[PDB]
Amino acid sequence: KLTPAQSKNPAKNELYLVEGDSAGGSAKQGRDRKFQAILPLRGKVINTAKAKMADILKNEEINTMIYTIGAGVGADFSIEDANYDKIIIMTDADTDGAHIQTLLLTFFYRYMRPLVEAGHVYIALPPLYKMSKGKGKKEEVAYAWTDGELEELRKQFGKGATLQRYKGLGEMNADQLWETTMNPETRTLIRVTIEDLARAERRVNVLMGDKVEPRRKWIEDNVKFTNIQNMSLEDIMGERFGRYSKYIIQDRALPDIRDGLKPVQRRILYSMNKDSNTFDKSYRKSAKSVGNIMGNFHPHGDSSIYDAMVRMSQNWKNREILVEMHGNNGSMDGDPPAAMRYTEARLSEIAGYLLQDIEKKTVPFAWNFDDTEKEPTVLPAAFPNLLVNGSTGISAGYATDIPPHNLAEVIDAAVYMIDHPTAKIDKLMEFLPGPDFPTGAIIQGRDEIKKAYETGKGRVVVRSKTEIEKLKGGKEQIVITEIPYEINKANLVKKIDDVRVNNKVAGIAEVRDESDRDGLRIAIELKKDANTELVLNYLFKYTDLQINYNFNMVAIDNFTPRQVGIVPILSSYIAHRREVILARSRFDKEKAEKRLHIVEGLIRVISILDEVIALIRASENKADAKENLKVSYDFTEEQAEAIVTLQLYRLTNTDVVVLQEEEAELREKIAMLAAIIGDERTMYNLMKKELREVKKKFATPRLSSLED
Amino acid sequence: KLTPAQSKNPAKNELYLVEGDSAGGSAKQGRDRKFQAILPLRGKVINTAKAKMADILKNEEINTMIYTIGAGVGADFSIEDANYDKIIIMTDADTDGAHIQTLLLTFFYRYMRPLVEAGHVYIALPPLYKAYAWTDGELEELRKLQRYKGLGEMNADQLWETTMNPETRTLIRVTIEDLARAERRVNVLMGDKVEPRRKWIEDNVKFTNIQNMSLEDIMGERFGRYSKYIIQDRALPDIRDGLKPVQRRILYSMNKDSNTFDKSYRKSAKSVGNIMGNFHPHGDSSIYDAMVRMSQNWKNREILVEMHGNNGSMDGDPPAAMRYTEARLSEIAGYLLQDIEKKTVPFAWNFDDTEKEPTVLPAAFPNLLVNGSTGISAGYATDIPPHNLAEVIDAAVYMIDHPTAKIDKLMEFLPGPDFPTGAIIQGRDEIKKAYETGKGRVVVRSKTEIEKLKGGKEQIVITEIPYEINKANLVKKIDDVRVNNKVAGIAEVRDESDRDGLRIAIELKKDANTELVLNYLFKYTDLQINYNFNMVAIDNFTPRQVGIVPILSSYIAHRREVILARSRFDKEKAEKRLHIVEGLIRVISILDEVIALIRASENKADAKENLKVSYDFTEEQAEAIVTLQLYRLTNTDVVVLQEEEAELREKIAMLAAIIGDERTMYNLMKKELREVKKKFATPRLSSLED
DNA sequence: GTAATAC
DNA sequence: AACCGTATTAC
DNA sequence: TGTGGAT
DNA sequence: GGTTATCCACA
Ligand SMILES: Cc1c(N2CC[C@@H]([C@H](C)N)C2)c(F)cc2c(=O)n(N)c(=O)n(C3CC3)c12
Ligand SMILES: Cc1c(N2CC[C@@H]([C@H](C)N)C2)c(F)cc2c(=O)n(N)c(=O)n(C3CC3)c12
Ligand SMILES: [Mg+2]
Ligand SMILES: [Mg+2]
Ligand SMILES: [Mg+2]
Ligand SMILES: [Mg+2]
């Protein structure tokens, strides 16, 4: 696990804790082996301020750090016996690296304080940028850390340099690594020093401790959701965890309150759609989709991307699947989906509707990490995806659980709230009565559903749909045909058979999964004279045949986390749809005005065709022809360009009644569009009309039944 | 590992051997659990005709078959006490599936013969097309299409309907028709001896509800299918451009995507998925590992891919995964693709039938020798070491001018291999031998030097090591020598290699026979090795053992083909244009009546027809005329056009001559070869001796 | 025992 | 992101 | 425990 | 291609 330096020298030797085996590799190659050791950290590092000292001892990483520094841990820690003068934390300069620096520091604090107090623990800063320039053989390069340092490089170099924005240590060669972050004579470091032992204890415990409330409050109060230098432990931990917190809150774990997507989902959709990988066209190798995503939009592991893509495709997790996938995309038994090298995929037809009108400038775009392509920050959302498909849900200081809903019900609620902005929950619940899990079952708790629909939190009960079949020999048989959302069929069955094997309740002959490609069925065969209600009851209480589902509805509203209920959600959707439909209408109106202008021009041209040809023949060149067109006949620039760039064959379709029809069509179109832009009510009707069109086209029956 | 049926019944119960854990998944999901069990075979199954009965017994996949079937193995096999009525092998309808069946069958012919003789072994044929078709013949009737690349693209519902359901499935039943003609077929195709296999392949492989098939037949079609493919479309290089198909697809795909030496690097994963989705229907690991090799300058003499990040090291440590790295084509790679846009090379459809791909690249330098190739197919394998680009080109140029040249003269320009890792190559006569027959055994030995140290001690210092040798294992193997005192005098071993140099120090003890030691290490560690030429390439769709002459000849032939093709293409462009310009020049002389005629016309179609009829314009001219933008009518400069007419004519003459005169053509070829040499030449690294 | 495309 | 097994040839 | 984007 | 550990919140 450890790559030891060549010669033991407690006075010079350095220990590099590197983020990941891959960068560990590069660093093994780039090091100076006389005095630098490498010790890769394979994945996120254990929070030694949250976990049991037991699990902490059993930890592969912690154990090998205690034993290569060779000074023991805890109160039995002797600085004098250490094997390194410098410990150096070298992570990507990304938010997850920020997180790792945090975790490692809270270990060196808790269990090796003397090393931190003696200023022996540093943090290496990899560069953020590399500027051009050249071409292949004759190509030069320089590095920068501050957007300011970058501005100064642009002064030199000049044109035509090109910036490479480093996304993490993985895109550096060993030669580049050494020169910029490992060479003692070249590198910028940070020395963690403790300035105030007191102020540093509270800082570490708030952020890294087991208690959630404090941390939530620390984040609410500090995070603004809108050579060698010293940093304090308090100040560093503050700044690094602040970055991670903000990031996984607004850009990883929680869905946007308008389209109900996490950023990775939005990118999966946007990418596949750009590439015309749509419901009406041939499937397409998953790996091809995943790589395009990873290359154009989402700078994270393929497995995160693929796994997300997969989930949006499983109809027992999504109420209305957004991706269709050919092949083994898993099962309710929780077995593993085929690797992205085996499967093909495309957008579902309904996904199309989440994306409807995206070409029409209806939604804010941001630059991507390459600064090479724009991507959308929210989708146009032609149905209220947050409630229909749900979300879940773990961040920092916040987590989220929102159950799926029946498309027709959600839309009915919305259409009501559109006519009646001030509607109370009691009334919306006549349209939207409760969750509809794609897996069906029975949902119990009208009261707790209101609580949740009102506060974002609530606890409801989900219970399996059962039936009793009689068998020959006078013996009964419990048959289960629907089970509760998010429950693994295979385990459930094992856990029930466990009840039989342990004879927890009397009367169980045999458990058998009898589910086949078209239908779920767990048969529980009872004995001769078993109290059949006694069994069913015990199984509800002591296995997941029946569970508690907990609403924790948190979404991102105006850039910040928000515990929210049916009303903040529905109105947020409505508000959003409003911005879009207006944007859309502005777009189409401008496009129609421009055309109308040309068409007006062509209509005049036709009546003076001969004069115009003569006049163009008479000009010297393109520009000259346009000026003569303007001056002699008062056409505008935009018309003149249009006229002068018609191809010759056009002087045959010299037909003005058909152009006049287009003119009329356009005036009428423009009138319709203007009315939408100019009157809230006309526009909300357009919204209601479209929402109804989607319900007609996609509605399906409830699956889950309701009881209180 | 096994998914067993619900009820035990040796009358109905079926055992499904599914290629892949992944399809094993679909299988488990799609079956009828009351009587169908699932055993996924996870990867290529062991050859039970080559391996020892030692390793055959320790085998994971073999064991669990001998234990799930529960009848015992080999001679202690009682069919009576079995567990299934039908053992059903179910793989991709691809070449590797074919191979897999082949390996299973040889297991069931060798260690459970009774089972195959009583016809309990079957072969599930999955559909080729989507309604579903199996024959390219049935597809004609169904067409009054998704072409399936494997079981993996199939939903569990579809699996059941097409190939698992006893009512809808099309099976093949394995039968032994001639117990002896069958022993020979299996022994020949799957046994230890290669020569009988090679011969079998040369004589048979033409490189151009329930039916019963013989074991001699099934193994014939199956192994021939895999053989041919593995020989043509995997392991061996095209003699012309030196690429194996995965490599050619890696380059063509990245090139198509503008991922070139002069442009910023793309994420390795994006490139790889593009290759996988567009051209190469195999696993990403293969594709990426290939991409990575082409980027390592201690394996290629002239790297075709530039990769940012951890792409491995001479110490043999794993390259970062494709999610970490980025890449682009190297400048020289550009030259392999030069002129591809010009119809200079044969294209074929891809599997998807969406895109055409090239079957050989233009190859402006002779890649096969420069970079070399290795090398393991069926009945054949290949090793061809890298050479120095200036030297290869010098040879080719001499040969262009002297087609019937002898190896001896050619070796004045191409003295022998030039390994990217340098070192010392010993053996001129074996080099000659290899250049003559494509087989040869030379010696490759490390660049050494002796540093004197304080205290009357000497130090042996390594600076280059043999091609294909792992630095780290070497350094370890030398140290073992020290630690076990096999030979005497080693004080310490130190790898002192840094980011910009290779250096291994062997410190010796006071008064230790430094030659004795150095000889010992040469013989007993890879400090010195024997490299073996076995130059096999693909010429005319078939494997050919070849030396320096057919290689150079084939390259020259190829270049001739490309240059001619290229020259036809440019000439046709120049002519299509000359023709139009003649048309315009005319039009200007009679501008007024043409505008009139178009004016009179009743639409584009009628206008073109009127131009042709009234003024003898051709279609192509008419088209051009009639799609001019109005502002064109402003110009009446016939002189600028006439200058273009002249330039096109000079151009056409020069091109025609290349097509019409062999000497002209070959001069061009030489001119271009020399430019490439001038641009990319670098000095020898490996020294020569005999 | 390796090498490098495949599973 | 490493680890694990196997086919194929040849020395 | 287990959930799903992350390393 | 499965397995193996972690973060983070909340029952
Ligand atoms: C399964 C399998 C292995 N193993 C490890 C154990 C062995 C068992 C004995 N079949 C299979 C193995 F050790 C390596 C791979 C592999 O590298 N790549 N790229 C793969 O795609 N697979 C899958 C076969 C396709 C691998
Ligand atoms: C390393 C590591 C693991 N392990 C198992 C042991 C453990 C110890 C803590 N290093 C690391 C592990 F068990 C699973 C993964 C993983 O699924 N995916 N997708 C990954 O990319 N990695 C790498 C971390 C990024 C994994
Ligand atoms: Mg990173
Ligand atoms: Mg329960
Ligand atoms: Mg296959
Ligand atoms: Mg040797």
PDB file of C-alpha atoms in Angstrom, chain B residues 539-678:
ATOM      1  CA  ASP B 539      -1.977  -9.817 -47.031  1.00  0.00           C
ATOM      2  CA  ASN B 540      -5.026 -10.289 -49.251  1.00  0.00           C
ATOM      3  CA  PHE B 541      -7.293 -11.292 -46.314  1.00  0.00           C
ATOM      4  CA  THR B 542      -5.040 -14.126 -45.237  1.00  0.00           C
ATOM      5  CA  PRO B 543      -2.122 -14.736 -42.810  1.00  0.00           C
ATOM      6  CA  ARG B 544       1.395 -14.644 -44.430  1.00  0.00           C
ATOM      7  CA  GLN B 545       4.786 -15.216 -42.883  1.00  0.00           C
ATOM      8  CA  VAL B 546       6.899 -12.529 -44.532  1.00  0.00           C
ATOM      9  CA  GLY B 547      10.259 -10.823 -44.440  1.00  0.00           C
ATOM     10  CA  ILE B 548      11.575  -7.362 -45.259  1.00  0.00           C
ATOM     11  CA  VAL B 549      10.872  -7.680 -49.009  1.00  0.00           C
ATOM     12  CA  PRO B 550       7.158  -8.585 -49.303  1.00  0.00           C
ATOM     13  CA  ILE B 551       6.550  -6.033 -46.515  1.00  0.00           C
ATOM     14  CA  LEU B 552       8.254  -3.185 -48.398  1.00  0.00           C
ATOM     15  CA  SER B 553       6.792  -4.356 -51.681  1.00  0.00           C
ATOM     16  CA  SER B 554       3.228  -4.380 -50.276  1.00  0.00           C
ATOM     17  CA  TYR B 555       3.717  -0.907 -48.790  1.00  0.00           C
ATOM     18  CA  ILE B 556       4.977   0.482 -52.062  1.00  0.00           C
ATOM     19  CA  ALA B 557       2.061  -1.215 -53.901  1.00  0.00           C
ATOM     20  CA  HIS B 558      -0.384   0.338 -51.435  1.00  0.00           C
ATOM     21  CA  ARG B 559       1.159   3.798 -51.764  1.00  0.00           C
ATOM     22  CA  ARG B 560       0.795   3.485 -55.518  1.00  0.00           C
ATOM     23  CA  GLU B 561      -2.871   2.663 -55.047  1.00  0.00           C
ATOM     24  CA  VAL B 562      -3.492   5.561 -52.701  1.00  0.00           C
ATOM     25  CA  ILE B 563      -1.628   8.139 -54.758  1.00  0.00           C
ATOM     26  CA  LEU B 564      -3.494   7.146 -57.898  1.00  0.00           C
ATOM     27  CA  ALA B 565      -6.865   7.222 -56.069  1.00  0.00           C
ATOM     28  CA  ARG B 566      -6.038  10.548 -54.484  1.00  0.00           C
ATOM     29  CA  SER B 567      -4.991  11.922 -57.857  1.00  0.00           C
ATOM     30  CA  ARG B 568      -8.256  10.786 -59.502  1.00  0.00           C
ATOM     31  CA  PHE B 569     -10.294  12.433 -56.789  1.00  0.00           C
ATOM     32  CA  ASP B 570      -8.597  15.841 -57.029  1.00  0.00           C
ATOM     33  CA  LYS B 571      -8.729  15.721 -60.795  1.00  0.00           C
ATOM     34  CA  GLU B 572     -12.414  15.006 -60.793  1.00  0.00           C
ATOM     35  CA  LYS B 573     -12.962  18.011 -58.477  1.00  0.00           C
ATOM     36  CA  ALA B 574     -10.812  20.151 -60.700  1.00  0.00           C
ATOM     37  CA  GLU B 575     -12.758  19.022 -63.753  1.00  0.00           C
ATOM     38  CA  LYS B 576     -16.294  19.382 -62.219  1.00  0.00           C
ATOM     39  CA  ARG B 577     -15.242  22.976 -61.563  1.00  0.00           C
ATOM     40  CA  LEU B 578     -13.583  23.645 -64.935  1.00  0.00           C
ATOM     41  CA  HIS B 579     -16.816  22.591 -66.572  1.00  0.00           C
ATOM     42  CA  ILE B 580     -18.859  25.004 -64.470  1.00  0.00           C
ATOM     43  CA  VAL B 581     -16.449  27.906 -65.133  1.00  0.00           C
ATOM     44  CA  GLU B 582     -16.684  27.343 -68.863  1.00  0.00           C
ATOM     45  CA  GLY B 583     -20.470  27.560 -68.395  1.00  0.00           C
ATOM     46  CA  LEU B 584     -20.310  30.868 -66.476  1.00  0.00           C
ATOM     47  CA  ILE B 585     -17.865  32.399 -68.962  1.00  0.00           C
ATOM     48  CA  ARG B 586     -20.376  31.635 -71.674  1.00  0.00           C
ATOM     49  CA  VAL B 587     -23.320  32.883 -69.644  1.00  0.00           C
ATOM     50  CA  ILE B 588     -21.756  36.344 -69.295  1.00  0.00           C
ATOM     51  CA  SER B 589     -21.485  36.739 -73.054  1.00  0.00           C
ATOM     52  CA  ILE B 590     -25.226  36.128 -73.185  1.00  0.00           C
ATOM     53  CA  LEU B 591     -26.350  37.248 -69.752  1.00  0.00           C
ATOM     54  CA  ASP B 592     -29.399  39.177 -70.966  1.00  0.00           C
ATOM     55  CA  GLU B 593     -31.074  36.291 -72.841  1.00  0.00           C
ATOM     56  CA  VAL B 594     -30.385  33.831 -69.981  1.00  0.00           C
ATOM     57  CA  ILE B 595     -32.133  35.962 -67.378  1.00  0.00           C
ATOM     58  CA  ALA B 596     -34.910  36.252 -69.911  1.00  0.00           C
ATOM     59  CA  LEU B 597     -35.116  32.464 -70.375  1.00  0.00           C
ATOM     60  CA  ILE B 598     -35.138  31.790 -66.641  1.00  0.00           C
ATOM     61  CA  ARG B 599     -37.768  34.496 -66.421  1.00  0.00           C
ATOM     62  CA  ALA B 600     -39.883  32.662 -68.998  1.00  0.00           C
ATOM     63  CA  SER B 601     -39.427  29.296 -67.280  1.00  0.00           C
ATOM     64  CA  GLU B 602     -42.108  27.774 -65.039  1.00  0.00           C
ATOM     65  CA  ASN B 603     -39.898  26.565 -62.179  1.00  0.00           C
ATOM     66  CA  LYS B 604     -36.371  25.320 -61.469  1.00  0.00           C
ATOM     67  CA  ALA B 605     -36.808  22.017 -63.291  1.00  0.00           C
ATOM     68  CA  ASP B 606     -38.068  23.765 -66.473  1.00  0.00           C
ATOM     69  CA  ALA B 607     -35.343  26.401 -66.289  1.00  0.00           C
ATOM     70  CA  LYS B 608     -32.541  23.848 -66.316  1.00  0.00           C
ATOM     71  CA  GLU B 609     -34.298  22.064 -69.175  1.00  0.00           C
ATOM     72  CA  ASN B 610     -34.615  25.341 -71.092  1.00  0.00           C
ATOM     73  CA  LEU B 611     -30.958  26.165 -70.629  1.00  0.00           C
ATOM     74  CA  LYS B 612     -29.951  22.743 -71.960  1.00  0.00           C
ATOM     75  CA  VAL B 613     -32.201  22.951 -74.991  1.00  0.00           C
ATOM     76  CA  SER B 614     -31.744  26.575 -76.087  1.00  0.00           C
ATOM     77  CA  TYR B 615     -28.026  26.844 -75.312  1.00  0.00           C
ATOM     78  CA  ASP B 616     -26.480  23.368 -75.069  1.00  0.00           C
ATOM     79  CA  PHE B 617     -25.632  23.691 -71.386  1.00  0.00           C
ATOM     80  CA  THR B 618     -25.070  20.469 -69.486  1.00  0.00           C
ATOM     81  CA  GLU B 619     -27.096  19.559 -66.407  1.00  0.00           C
ATOM     82  CA  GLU B 620     -24.253  20.354 -64.053  1.00  0.00           C
ATOM     83  CA  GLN B 621     -23.789  23.714 -65.760  1.00  0.00           C
ATOM     84  CA  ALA B 622     -27.515  24.378 -65.765  1.00  0.00           C
ATOM     85  CA  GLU B 623     -27.717  23.566 -62.063  1.00  0.00           C
ATOM     86  CA  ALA B 624     -24.881  25.933 -61.258  1.00  0.00           C
ATOM     87  CA  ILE B 625     -26.316  28.697 -63.431  1.00  0.00           C
ATOM     88  CA  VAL B 626     -29.759  28.443 -61.974  1.00  0.00           C
ATOM     89  CA  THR B 627     -28.688  28.446 -58.327  1.00  0.00           C
ATOM     90  CA  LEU B 628     -26.579  31.612 -58.603  1.00  0.00           C
ATOM     91  CA  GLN B 629     -27.595  34.364 -56.191  1.00  0.00           C
ATOM     92  CA  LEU B 630     -28.940  37.558 -57.827  1.00  0.00           C
ATOM     93  CA  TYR B 631     -25.938  39.680 -56.922  1.00  0.00           C
ATOM     94  CA  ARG B 632     -23.775  37.553 -59.187  1.00  0.00           C
ATOM     95  CA  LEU B 633     -25.481  39.397 -62.072  1.00  0.00           C
ATOM     96  CA  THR B 634     -23.447  42.437 -61.024  1.00  0.00           C
ATOM     97  CA  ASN B 635     -20.178  40.963 -62.255  1.00  0.00           C
ATOM     98  CA  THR B 636     -19.041  40.815 -65.862  1.00  0.00           C
ATOM     99  CA  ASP B 637     -15.343  40.154 -65.362  1.00  0.00           C
ATOM    100  CA  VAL B 638     -14.523  37.307 -67.666  1.00  0.00           C
ATOM    101  CA  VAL B 639     -10.812  37.747 -67.027  1.00  0.00           C
ATOM    102  CA  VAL B 640     -10.661  36.593 -63.428  1.00  0.00           C
ATOM    103  CA  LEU B 641     -12.651  33.512 -64.496  1.00  0.00           C
ATOM    104  CA  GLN B 642     -10.272  32.896 -67.367  1.00  0.00           C
ATOM    105  CA  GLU B 643      -7.359  33.016 -64.906  1.00  0.00           C
ATOM    106  CA  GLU B 644      -9.095  30.250 -62.929  1.00  0.00           C
ATOM    107  CA  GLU B 645      -9.656  28.230 -66.138  1.00  0.00           C
ATOM    108  CA  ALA B 646      -5.920  28.333 -66.775  1.00  0.00           C
ATOM    109  CA  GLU B 647      -4.990  27.317 -63.222  1.00  0.00           C
ATOM    110  CA  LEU B 648      -7.441  24.356 -63.350  1.00  0.00           C
ATOM    111  CA  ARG B 649      -6.025  23.155 -66.637  1.00  0.00           C
ATOM    112  CA  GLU B 650      -2.415  23.213 -65.337  1.00  0.00           C
ATOM    113  CA  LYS B 651      -3.673  21.312 -62.302  1.00  0.00           C
ATOM    114  CA  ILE B 652      -5.460  18.697 -64.382  1.00  0.00           C
ATOM    115  CA  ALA B 653      -2.448  18.104 -66.602  1.00  0.00           C
ATOM    116  CA  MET B 654      -0.212  17.489 -63.598  1.00  0.00           C
ATOM    117  CA  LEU B 655      -2.680  15.047 -62.131  1.00  0.00           C
ATOM    118  CA  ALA B 656      -3.411  13.168 -65.369  1.00  0.00           C
ATOM    119  CA  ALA B 657       0.308  12.540 -65.894  1.00  0.00           C
ATOM    120  CA  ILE B 658       0.568  10.931 -62.459  1.00  0.00           C
ATOM    121  CA  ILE B 659      -2.236   8.579 -63.383  1.00  0.00           C
ATOM    122  CA  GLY B 660      -0.830   7.976 -66.895  1.00  0.00           C
ATOM    123  CA  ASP B 661       2.901   7.565 -66.192  1.00  0.00           C
ATOM    124  CA  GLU B 662       4.337   5.100 -63.653  1.00  0.00           C
ATOM    125  CA  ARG B 663       7.660   6.915 -63.387  1.00  0.00           C
ATOM    126  CA  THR B 664       5.938  10.229 -62.656  1.00  0.00           C
ATOM    127  CA  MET B 665       3.810   8.523 -60.000  1.00  0.00           C
ATOM    128  CA  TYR B 666       6.790   6.809 -58.286  1.00  0.00           C
ATOM    129  CA  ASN B 667       8.729  10.065 -58.247  1.00  0.00           C
ATOM    130  CA  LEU B 668       5.858  11.648 -56.301  1.00  0.00           C
ATOM    131  CA  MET B 669       5.905   8.765 -53.898  1.00  0.00           C
ATOM    132  CA  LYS B 670       9.620   9.232 -53.337  1.00  0.00           C
ATOM    133  CA  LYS B 671       9.256  13.006 -52.901  1.00  0.00           C
ATOM    134  CA  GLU B 672       6.600  12.524 -50.229  1.00  0.00           C
ATOM    135  CA  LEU B 673       8.489   9.751 -48.427  1.00  0.00           C
ATOM    136  CA  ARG B 674      11.506  12.041 -48.156  1.00  0.00           C
ATOM    137  CA  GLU B 675       9.420  14.936 -46.754  1.00  0.00           C
ATOM    138  CA  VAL B 676       8.104  12.599 -44.036  1.00  0.00           C
ATOM    139  CA  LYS B 677      11.625  11.440 -43.246  1.00  0.00           C
ATOM    140  CA  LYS B 678      12.904  15.015 -43.175  1.00  0.00           C
TER     141      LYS B 678
END
